[PDB]
Amino acid sequence: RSKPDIKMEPSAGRPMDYQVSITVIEARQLVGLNMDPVVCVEVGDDKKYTSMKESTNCPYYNEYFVFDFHVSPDVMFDKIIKISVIHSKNLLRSGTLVGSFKMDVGTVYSQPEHQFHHKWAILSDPDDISAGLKGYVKCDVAVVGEDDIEGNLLLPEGVPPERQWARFYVKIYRAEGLPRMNTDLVDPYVQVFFAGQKGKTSVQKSSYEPLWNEQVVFTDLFPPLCKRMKVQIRDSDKVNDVAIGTHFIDLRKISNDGDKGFLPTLGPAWVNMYGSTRNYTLLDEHQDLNEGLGEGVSFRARLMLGLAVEILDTSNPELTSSTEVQVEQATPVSESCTGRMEEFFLFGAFLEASMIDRKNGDKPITFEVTIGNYGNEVDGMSRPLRPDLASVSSTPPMRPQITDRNYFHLPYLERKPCIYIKSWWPDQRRRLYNANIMDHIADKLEEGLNDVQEMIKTEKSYPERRLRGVLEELSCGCHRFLSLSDKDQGRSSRTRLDRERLKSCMRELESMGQQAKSLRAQVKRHTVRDKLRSCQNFLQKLRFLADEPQHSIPDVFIWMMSNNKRIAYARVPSKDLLFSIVEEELGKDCAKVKTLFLKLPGKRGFGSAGWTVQAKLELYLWLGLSKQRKDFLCGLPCGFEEVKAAQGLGLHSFPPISLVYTKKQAFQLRAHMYQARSLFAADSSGLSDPFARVFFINQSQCTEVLNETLCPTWDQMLVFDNLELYGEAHELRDDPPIIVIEIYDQDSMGKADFMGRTFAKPLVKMADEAYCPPRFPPQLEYYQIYRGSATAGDLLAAFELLQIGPSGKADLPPINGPVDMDRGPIMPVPVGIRPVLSKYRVEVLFWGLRDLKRVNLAQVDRPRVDIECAGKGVQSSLIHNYKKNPNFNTLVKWFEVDLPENELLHPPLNIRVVDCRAFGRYTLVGSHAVSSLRRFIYRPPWWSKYFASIDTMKEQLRQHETDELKVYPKELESEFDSFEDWLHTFNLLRGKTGDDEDGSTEEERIVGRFKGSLCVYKVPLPEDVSREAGYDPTYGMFQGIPSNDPINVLVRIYVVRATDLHPADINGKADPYIAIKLGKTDIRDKENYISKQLNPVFGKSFDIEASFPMESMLTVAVYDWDLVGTDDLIGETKIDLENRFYSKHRATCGIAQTYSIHGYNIWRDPMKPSQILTRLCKEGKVDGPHFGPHGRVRVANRVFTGPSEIEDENGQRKPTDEHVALSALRHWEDIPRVGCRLVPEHVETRPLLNPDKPGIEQGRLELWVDMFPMDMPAPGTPLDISPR
């Protein structure tokens, strides 16, 4: 696989809705006298307080606090939680602070389920090193998108409870390259933030190159729970205090905990921070990028910085007792120790630049390649003289040309402009060289893991030894890094972090080279699927080691301007651009023709401000020293000449300002698009008008618009012709240029609306290659379609890029073009590339549909469902009365349709339901299409036992982490395949698909939910299938299916107890009761609510008739009782008795362990197990039962044995058939054709869900539900499970 995944809108910089929740449970061992504590919780600037507790050292609150944000993930993690015991706070007095505990959101989120539970917050006096410990405050925390103190601390691993105060020195020396503010001078000062404490240097007025040589001194507890420092170059404008740039120092990459690791240190070395545009806009909408809230769009400033964390002894009297952020003159160092100053030379070559927006391509456009302070001559820098060349940094303004209505292209063609920059940077190439080595190893690890996952999920053989070879290559790469990075250990201009961090990666990857060989033995033929997920734990640490805090050279920016106004940008990091003689030290984007996509600056690159590509460039880049420009043209496309400028005429080492091209290979691209599927709904009808517009270099071609479908089959090859590819064959065969496929809805105005985008790489054939298998012809395989943030479709294509031949286009294999003469210029996908189509009969069970939401404050009385698959389709019977009978009057009605032979290439079968209005205007009220037909392909083949079962499920929990009845430790539909044995369930949709800014949510699209079954088989059909359709052609495969007809059904619910219910009251002990909604019937136990109970025991039994299957929709709920207003809601759950009732699993009544009619084991099913087995025999078309003696039975070709006799409550021996009958119920899977499993009498663990707090647990409930139809013999009297 070489197909790219270049997403224009990644997760970085995306803001999401977030919630922080805190319960302040209690406090104990508080140090002091007569304190009356008010616990204060501050997250950011939002501060809340508890209630009043009077004169205690051990208070109890159990109070709740909720805060909500909508910020980017890195913005959240710097925010500080400030739980504090504050003695005697009121509105006029800031109370006397006992102690506090500063600890950020990122440490919460680093916990595996993002929570801390019942843990004691280690409060300490934050403004005194010598003050004692200030007790512990038991609390719990949660961030969502035993009671001993030492066993339950609120700390991560490694942190001692007796934390040591340490001075967190940061040193601010000098800065360079500052932009304009005043009209246009600058007045800088640097402000540092850490754990709410701030410290700023003195302002040096009127200097682009300041030199403070000052430092900011914090005082905080080692190890720091606040995890980043906000270092921010700032301008001291007196009216508007505005920032220039911001870099975050990450504490984990500069440290390793323990004596085996090292204390944190950094620098003194340069730091490259970014922000808004290079010019000073009078109003700057990218001011948030100056604040570091997102990705920086242009380089703002660079700043030498240091870090000198030193641990103090808390009992030392000579130290300063205050923890304030003092301002102190630092100790300056020479700039030679930061790196020997060297000259660097950038090279760039613009080959192609297409896909320019039509709204901006009216005028001649200019590029601008910049690296840091150098290469920005057009903007008029505040640069001094040479610390020289004119620094040609712009392509000439060239008139664009039209590709289509959407996009332009640039007529570079034979002339490719080039840009070369002189720059001066400190030589710190090893920080990016080791990053390149370990990034190459991590890229190989990514490719191996993705190949193993893709090849595992396609079930191609031999996976685990391939994974073992991947980890063997990983071990070889570990040894390669062990040998490579040691070659310049004795460098003199080297910081302490460059020693200790390097030692850390040496130790880690030395261990990793043997952990790979250990997990090589751990990976087997059956454990490969989960050890593959275990393998990327290595990849997490390797990606973490790959990035480094010490910057040397800032990132290379490529810009766009017309009228010298910036419209589009890109930012490639410079670490992949250095040239090195070591292949692992060589950057990934260096000396290679790299595809790169521009995007809009700031917040307007996301969402509805633009979805179109700003530009697509085949940019060549190179970076290195000015003495290393020896062979920097080795990766360029050959067959070219160089045109140079006046400053470097005749010099062999001088780079050209432009190239003129002598080789123009004619290339024809056969773009085979056959199908798209699961697309976005851009039209108001819940469907779209999709067509594929494919871009390749300077031209574009369009397939014809298909109408009113989300799974189009265009079946349309487009032949791009007479295009020009430059260079030789070795730059195209193993790495062709990219293909961008864009999907659009042909709307009512004529102008199309955006639908998505996918990328591709064609299989390349030169004229000397034979068009022979296994390479040619190219097979169809999928391409994931993205519409920016979210996935919005899947496309099927088999692109091949072919040379236009030495004699003509006829040297290519002959095009199997338009045999259908009406197609004309539209031309089909040829045979061999299209799949073989074999006829499959599709059989639909039109069972019914429930749970329609009341759109337009009513319900549709006459719905009818049409199924459409690959053009062909069938329709059900029209509903004559929906509320009386929500079930179609149709048997298994089928249609025969040509389908793809390969099962992975099956199209999504569409299901839609319409209201049958006048004139055949079939207005859609629901539509669901997402299914894979391989699933539907058919080929012929009381307390006394309860507490014992409680001990049993404790054993089941302890074995999972390492009489009687069954206990399921998860939800009942998890064990029993959701009772979807043949009565399948699908979920309908309506409206436009939910874009994050233009559309609704996906829950708002939910309108109905279909019940039915699908059976797919070939029309050349097998022999047992010929028997099955033989008994009834009106049912097909569906023989012996029970009737649809409605019935009154008794609903019998036993509820045992509830556990760990979330209280709404601030005391922490709710007042719950059981509330049951069944169909349209309300039953509440509010008169018998169990007050003041976290784990109440109900023991109530409820019998209530329902109009099944219309009333087969039940919720079992718990309600915190409240007389005033309404009772607070805890949570509900979905039951849906319909899939229980008609299942073969016998969900009507559970079966006990052994047959007994006395005491706590009395057979509660009114129909005895012998009659149960006879019923399952006639319903399962299997002969039986055939009892001999009461201890044995023959059912089909199988024999079951067991006991024979039972005593009643009178103690008299009654021999019945029921014992071996119930034993056969517990061996009912032995039947070779109809065998299955039966539901036993059980108890169940039920998650409760509240839409007030979605996606998280509200408590558990234990219960089990039986039900009985009212034409069978009458149910037994309601049993009682009242507690002891």
Numbering used by the authors: 251 to 395, 411 to 448, 464 to 667, 695 to 1248, 1323 to 1343, 1401 to 1722
Sentences copied from the publication:
Thought to be a core component of the SV-tethering and SV-fusion machinery, otoferlin is anchored through a single C-terminal transmembrane helix, cycles with SVs, and hence, it is found on both SVs and the plasma membrane of IHCs.
(G) C2F-C2B interface areas in the three resolved otoferlin states. An additional layer of complexity arises from the ability of otoferlin to toggle between discrete states in a Ca2+-dependent manner as it engages lipid membranes.
